[PDB]
PDB file of C-alpha atoms in Angstrom:
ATOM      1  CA  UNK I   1      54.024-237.439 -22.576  1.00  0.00           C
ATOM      2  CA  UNK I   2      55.328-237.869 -18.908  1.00  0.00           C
ATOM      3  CA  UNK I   3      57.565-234.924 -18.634  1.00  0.00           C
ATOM      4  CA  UNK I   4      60.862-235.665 -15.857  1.00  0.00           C
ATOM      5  CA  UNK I   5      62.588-233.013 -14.545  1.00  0.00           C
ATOM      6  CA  UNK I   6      66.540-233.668 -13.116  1.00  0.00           C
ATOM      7  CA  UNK I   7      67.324-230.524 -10.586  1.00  0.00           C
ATOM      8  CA  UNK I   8      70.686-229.293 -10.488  1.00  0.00           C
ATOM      9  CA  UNK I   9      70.411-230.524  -6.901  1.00  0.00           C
ATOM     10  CA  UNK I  10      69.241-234.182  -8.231  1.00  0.00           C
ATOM     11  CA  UNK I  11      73.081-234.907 -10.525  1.00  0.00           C
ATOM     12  CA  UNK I  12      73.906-237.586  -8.427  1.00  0.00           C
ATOM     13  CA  UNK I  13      73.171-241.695  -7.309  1.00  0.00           C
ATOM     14  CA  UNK I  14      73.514-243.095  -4.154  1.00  0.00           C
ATOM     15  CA  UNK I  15      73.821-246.762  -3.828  1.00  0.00           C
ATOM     16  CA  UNK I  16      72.577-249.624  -1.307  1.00  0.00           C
ATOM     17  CA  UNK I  17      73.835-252.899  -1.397  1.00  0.00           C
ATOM     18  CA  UNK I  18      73.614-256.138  -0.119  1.00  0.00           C
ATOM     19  CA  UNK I  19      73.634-260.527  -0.899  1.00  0.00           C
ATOM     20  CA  UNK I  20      70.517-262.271  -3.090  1.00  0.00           C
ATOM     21  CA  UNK I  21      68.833-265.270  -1.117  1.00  0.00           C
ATOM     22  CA  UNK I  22      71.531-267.679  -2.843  1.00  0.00           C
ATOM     23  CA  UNK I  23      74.563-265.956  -2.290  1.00  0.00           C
ATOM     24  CA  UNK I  24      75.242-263.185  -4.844  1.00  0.00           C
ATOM     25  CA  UNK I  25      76.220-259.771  -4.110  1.00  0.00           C
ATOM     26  CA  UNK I  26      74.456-256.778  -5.668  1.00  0.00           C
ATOM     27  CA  UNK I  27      74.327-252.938  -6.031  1.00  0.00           C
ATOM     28  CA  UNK I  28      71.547-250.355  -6.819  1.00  0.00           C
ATOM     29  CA  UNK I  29      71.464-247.014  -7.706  1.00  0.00           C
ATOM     30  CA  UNK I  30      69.337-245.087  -6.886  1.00  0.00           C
ATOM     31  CA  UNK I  31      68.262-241.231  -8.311  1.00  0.00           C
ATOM     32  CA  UNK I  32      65.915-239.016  -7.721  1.00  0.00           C
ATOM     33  CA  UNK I  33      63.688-236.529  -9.794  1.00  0.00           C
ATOM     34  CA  UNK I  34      60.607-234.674 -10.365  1.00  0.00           C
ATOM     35  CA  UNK I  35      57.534-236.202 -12.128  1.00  0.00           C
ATOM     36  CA  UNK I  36      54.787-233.210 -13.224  1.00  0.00           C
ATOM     37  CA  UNK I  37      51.508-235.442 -12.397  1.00  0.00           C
ATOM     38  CA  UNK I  38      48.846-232.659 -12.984  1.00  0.00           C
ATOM     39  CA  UNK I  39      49.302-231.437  -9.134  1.00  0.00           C
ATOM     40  CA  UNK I  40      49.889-227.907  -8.321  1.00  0.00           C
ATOM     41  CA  UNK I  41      53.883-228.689  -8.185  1.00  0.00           C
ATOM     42  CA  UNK I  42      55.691-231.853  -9.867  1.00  0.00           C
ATOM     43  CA  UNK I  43      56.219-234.532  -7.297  1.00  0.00           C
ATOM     44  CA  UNK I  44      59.429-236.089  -6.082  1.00  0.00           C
ATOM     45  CA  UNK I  45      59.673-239.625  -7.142  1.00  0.00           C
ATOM     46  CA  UNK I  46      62.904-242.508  -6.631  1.00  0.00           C
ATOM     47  CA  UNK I  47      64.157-244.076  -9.417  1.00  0.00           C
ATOM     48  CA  UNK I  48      66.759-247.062  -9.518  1.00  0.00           C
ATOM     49  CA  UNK I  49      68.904-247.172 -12.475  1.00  0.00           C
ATOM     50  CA  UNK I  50      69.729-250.042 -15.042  1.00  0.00           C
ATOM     51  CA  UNK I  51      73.292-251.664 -14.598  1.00  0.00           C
ATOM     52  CA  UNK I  52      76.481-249.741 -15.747  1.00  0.00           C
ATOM     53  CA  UNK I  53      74.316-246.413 -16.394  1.00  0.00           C
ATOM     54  CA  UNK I  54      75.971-243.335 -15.271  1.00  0.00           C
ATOM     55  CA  UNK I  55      73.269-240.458 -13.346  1.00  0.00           C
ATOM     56  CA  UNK I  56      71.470-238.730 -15.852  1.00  0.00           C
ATOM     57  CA  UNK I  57      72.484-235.041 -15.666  1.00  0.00           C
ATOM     58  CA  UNK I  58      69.677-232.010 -15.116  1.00  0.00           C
ATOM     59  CA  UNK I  59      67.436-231.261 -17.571  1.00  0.00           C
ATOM     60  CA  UNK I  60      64.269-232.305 -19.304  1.00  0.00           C
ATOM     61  CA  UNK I  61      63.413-235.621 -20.259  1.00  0.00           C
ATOM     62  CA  UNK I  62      60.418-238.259 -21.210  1.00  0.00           C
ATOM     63  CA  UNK I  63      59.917-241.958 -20.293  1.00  0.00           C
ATOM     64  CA  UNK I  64      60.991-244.447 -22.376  1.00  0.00           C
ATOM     65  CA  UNK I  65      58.843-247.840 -23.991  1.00  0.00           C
ATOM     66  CA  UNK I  66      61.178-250.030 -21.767  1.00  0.00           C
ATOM     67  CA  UNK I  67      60.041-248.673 -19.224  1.00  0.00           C
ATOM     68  CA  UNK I  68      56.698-250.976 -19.239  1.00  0.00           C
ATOM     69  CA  UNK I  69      55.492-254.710 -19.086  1.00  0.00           C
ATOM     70  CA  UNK I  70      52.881-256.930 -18.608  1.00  0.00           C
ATOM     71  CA  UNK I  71      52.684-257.965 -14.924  1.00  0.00           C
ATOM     72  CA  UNK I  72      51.710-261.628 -13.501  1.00  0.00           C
ATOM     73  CA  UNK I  73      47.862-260.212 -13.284  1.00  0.00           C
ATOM     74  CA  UNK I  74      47.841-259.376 -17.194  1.00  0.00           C
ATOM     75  CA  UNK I  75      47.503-255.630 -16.466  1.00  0.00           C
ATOM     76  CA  UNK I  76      50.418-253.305 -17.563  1.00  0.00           C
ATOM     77  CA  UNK I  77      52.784-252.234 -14.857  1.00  0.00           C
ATOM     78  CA  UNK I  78      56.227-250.183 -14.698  1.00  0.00           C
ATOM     79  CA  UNK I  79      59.376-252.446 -14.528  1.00  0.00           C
ATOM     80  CA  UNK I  80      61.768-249.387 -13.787  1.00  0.00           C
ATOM     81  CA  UNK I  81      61.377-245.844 -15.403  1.00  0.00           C
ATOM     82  CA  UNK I  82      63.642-245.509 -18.222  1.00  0.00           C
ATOM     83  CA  UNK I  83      64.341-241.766 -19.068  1.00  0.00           C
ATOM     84  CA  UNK I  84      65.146-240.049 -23.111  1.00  0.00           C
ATOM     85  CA  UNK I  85      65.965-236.629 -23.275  1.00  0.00           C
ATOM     86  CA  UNK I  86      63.193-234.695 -24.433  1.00  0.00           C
TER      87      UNK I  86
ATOM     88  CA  UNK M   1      53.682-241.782 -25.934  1.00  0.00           C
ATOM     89  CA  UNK M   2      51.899-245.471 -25.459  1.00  0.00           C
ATOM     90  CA  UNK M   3      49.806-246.288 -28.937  1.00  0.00           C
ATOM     91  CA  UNK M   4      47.445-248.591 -27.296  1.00  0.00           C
ATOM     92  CA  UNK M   5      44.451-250.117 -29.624  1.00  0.00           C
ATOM     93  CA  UNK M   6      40.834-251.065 -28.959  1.00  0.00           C
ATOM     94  CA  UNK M   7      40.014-253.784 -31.689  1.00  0.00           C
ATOM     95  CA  UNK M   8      36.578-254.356 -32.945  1.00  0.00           C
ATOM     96  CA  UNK M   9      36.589-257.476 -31.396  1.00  0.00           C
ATOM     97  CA  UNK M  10      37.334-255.776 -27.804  1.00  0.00           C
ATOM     98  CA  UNK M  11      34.192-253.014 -27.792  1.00  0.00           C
ATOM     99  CA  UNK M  12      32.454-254.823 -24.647  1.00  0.00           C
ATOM    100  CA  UNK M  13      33.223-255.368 -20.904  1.00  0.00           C
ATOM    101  CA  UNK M  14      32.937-258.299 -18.796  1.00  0.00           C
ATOM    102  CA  UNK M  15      32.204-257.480 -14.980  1.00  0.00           C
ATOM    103  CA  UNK M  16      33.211-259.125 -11.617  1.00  0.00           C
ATOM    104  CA  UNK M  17      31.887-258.915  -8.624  1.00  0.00           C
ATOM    105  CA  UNK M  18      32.374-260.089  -4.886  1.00  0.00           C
ATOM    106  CA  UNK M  19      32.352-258.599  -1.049  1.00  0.00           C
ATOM    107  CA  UNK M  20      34.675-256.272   0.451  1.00  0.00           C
ATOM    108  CA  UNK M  21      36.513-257.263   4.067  1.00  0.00           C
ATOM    109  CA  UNK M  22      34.087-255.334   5.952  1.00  0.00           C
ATOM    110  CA  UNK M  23      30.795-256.524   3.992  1.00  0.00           C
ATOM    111  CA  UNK M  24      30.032-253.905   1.350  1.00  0.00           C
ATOM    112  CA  UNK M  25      29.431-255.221  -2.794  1.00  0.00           C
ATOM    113  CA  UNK M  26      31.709-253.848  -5.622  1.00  0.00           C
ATOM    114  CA  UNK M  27      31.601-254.682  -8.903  1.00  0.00           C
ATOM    115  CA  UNK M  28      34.699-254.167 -11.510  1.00  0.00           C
ATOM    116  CA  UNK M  29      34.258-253.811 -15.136  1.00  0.00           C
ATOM    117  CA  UNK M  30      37.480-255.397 -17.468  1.00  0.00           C
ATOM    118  CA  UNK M  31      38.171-254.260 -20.686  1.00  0.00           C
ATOM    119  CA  UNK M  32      41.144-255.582 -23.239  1.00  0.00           C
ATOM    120  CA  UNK M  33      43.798-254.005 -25.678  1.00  0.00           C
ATOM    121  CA  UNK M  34      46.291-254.021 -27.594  1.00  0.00           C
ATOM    122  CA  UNK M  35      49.784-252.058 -26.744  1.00  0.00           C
ATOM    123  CA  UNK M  36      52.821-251.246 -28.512  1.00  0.00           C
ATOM    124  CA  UNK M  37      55.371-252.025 -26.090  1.00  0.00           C
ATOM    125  CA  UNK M  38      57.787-252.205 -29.359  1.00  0.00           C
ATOM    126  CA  UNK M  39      58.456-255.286 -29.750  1.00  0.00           C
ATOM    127  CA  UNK M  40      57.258-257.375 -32.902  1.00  0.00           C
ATOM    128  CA  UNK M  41      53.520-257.229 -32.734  1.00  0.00           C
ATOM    129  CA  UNK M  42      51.607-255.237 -29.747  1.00  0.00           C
ATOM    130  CA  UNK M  43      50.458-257.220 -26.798  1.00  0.00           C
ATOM    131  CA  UNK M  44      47.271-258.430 -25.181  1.00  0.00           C
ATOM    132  CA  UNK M  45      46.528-256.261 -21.701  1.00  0.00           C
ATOM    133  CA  UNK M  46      43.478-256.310 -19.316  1.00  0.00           C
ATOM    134  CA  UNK M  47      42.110-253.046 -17.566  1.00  0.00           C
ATOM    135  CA  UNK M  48      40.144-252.681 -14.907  1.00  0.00           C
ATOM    136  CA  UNK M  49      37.512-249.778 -15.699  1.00  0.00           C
ATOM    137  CA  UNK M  50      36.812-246.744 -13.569  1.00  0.00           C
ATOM    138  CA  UNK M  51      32.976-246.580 -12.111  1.00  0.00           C
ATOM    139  CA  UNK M  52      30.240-245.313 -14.094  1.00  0.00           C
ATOM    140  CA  UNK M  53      32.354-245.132 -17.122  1.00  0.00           C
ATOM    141  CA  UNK M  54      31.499-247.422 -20.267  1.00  0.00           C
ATOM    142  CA  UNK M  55      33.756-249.099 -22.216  1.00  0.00           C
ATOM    143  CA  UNK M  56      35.988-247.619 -24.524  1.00  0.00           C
ATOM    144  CA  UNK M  57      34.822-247.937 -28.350  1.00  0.00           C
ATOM    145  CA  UNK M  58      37.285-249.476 -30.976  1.00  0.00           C
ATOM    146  CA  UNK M  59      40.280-246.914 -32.257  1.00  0.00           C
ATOM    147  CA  UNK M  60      43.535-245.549 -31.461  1.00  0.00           C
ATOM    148  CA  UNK M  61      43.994-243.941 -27.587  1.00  0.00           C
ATOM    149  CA  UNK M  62      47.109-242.791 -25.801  1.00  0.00           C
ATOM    150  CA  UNK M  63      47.571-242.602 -21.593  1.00  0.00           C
ATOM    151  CA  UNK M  64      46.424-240.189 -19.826  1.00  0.00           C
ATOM    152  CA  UNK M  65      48.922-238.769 -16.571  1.00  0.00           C
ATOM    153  CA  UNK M  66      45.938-240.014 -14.020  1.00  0.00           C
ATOM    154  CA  UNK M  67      46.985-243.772 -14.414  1.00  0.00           C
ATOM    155  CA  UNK M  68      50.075-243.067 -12.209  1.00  0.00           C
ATOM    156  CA  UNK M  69      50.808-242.023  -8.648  1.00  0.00           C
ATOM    157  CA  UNK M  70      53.817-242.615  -6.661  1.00  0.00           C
ATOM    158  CA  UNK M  71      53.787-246.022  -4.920  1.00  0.00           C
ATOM    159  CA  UNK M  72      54.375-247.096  -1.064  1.00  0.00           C
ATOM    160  CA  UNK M  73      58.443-247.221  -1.883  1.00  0.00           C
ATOM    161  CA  UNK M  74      58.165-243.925  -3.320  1.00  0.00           C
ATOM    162  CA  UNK M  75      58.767-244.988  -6.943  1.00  0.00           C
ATOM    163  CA  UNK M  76      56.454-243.986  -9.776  1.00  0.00           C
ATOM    164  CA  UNK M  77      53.457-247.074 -10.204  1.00  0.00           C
ATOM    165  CA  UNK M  78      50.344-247.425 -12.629  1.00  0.00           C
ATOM    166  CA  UNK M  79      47.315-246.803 -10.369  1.00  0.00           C
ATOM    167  CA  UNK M  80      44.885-247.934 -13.063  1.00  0.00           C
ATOM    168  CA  UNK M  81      45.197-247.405 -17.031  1.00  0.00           C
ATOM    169  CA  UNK M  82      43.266-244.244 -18.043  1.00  0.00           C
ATOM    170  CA  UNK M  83      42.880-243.236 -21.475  1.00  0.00           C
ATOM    171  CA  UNK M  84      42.112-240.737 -24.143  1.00  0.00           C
ATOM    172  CA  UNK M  85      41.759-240.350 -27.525  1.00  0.00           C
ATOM    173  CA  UNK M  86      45.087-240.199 -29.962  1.00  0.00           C
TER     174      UNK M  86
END
């Protein structure tokens, strides 16, 4: 298990915005957090959220399933990291 | 934690090969599995082997944390699938 870390500093999204090649507008959010990797510290990695999902608050959590798929090259790939609390 | 499967059927590796930009040979061995991505039945992915390692032999294996590293944008990306035994 990926273990995720949400800082107290971390509780919040900040969003960018702009309009699709055909004319719709759109918004991301975006949060950050701290991903152990094996390294002496965890890293800091940048995660943008799913659609009408609030920041997750600090604490502990794992990556989800979801979080996967099978890219154009037939070779697994993240989509956008999902987050469970652990 | 992934569940991914090596079938009987997927115990060998096929290798490609080519020339690098600046004239050096590489060779890439390509395994396949099976992974629970939780959907109705597992599905078919292709990995591309680490050097000097054979192929994995037919069981259950989980992911190990070396297959990811934070990407370009700064988000969290599968280098190359690593695993180990469940």
């Amino acid at each position: 298990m990926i273990k995720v870390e949400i800082k107290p500093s971390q509780a919040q999204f900040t969003t960018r915005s702009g309009v699709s090649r055909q004319g719709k507008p759109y918004s991301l959010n975006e949060q950050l957090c701290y991903i152990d990797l094996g390294n002496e510290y965890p890293v800091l990695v940048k995660m943008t959220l799913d659609e009408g999902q609030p920041a997750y608050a600090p604490g502990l959590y794992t990556v989800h399933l979801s979080s996967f798929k099978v890219g154009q090259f037939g070779s697994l790939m993240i989509d956008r990291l999902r987050l469970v609390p652990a």
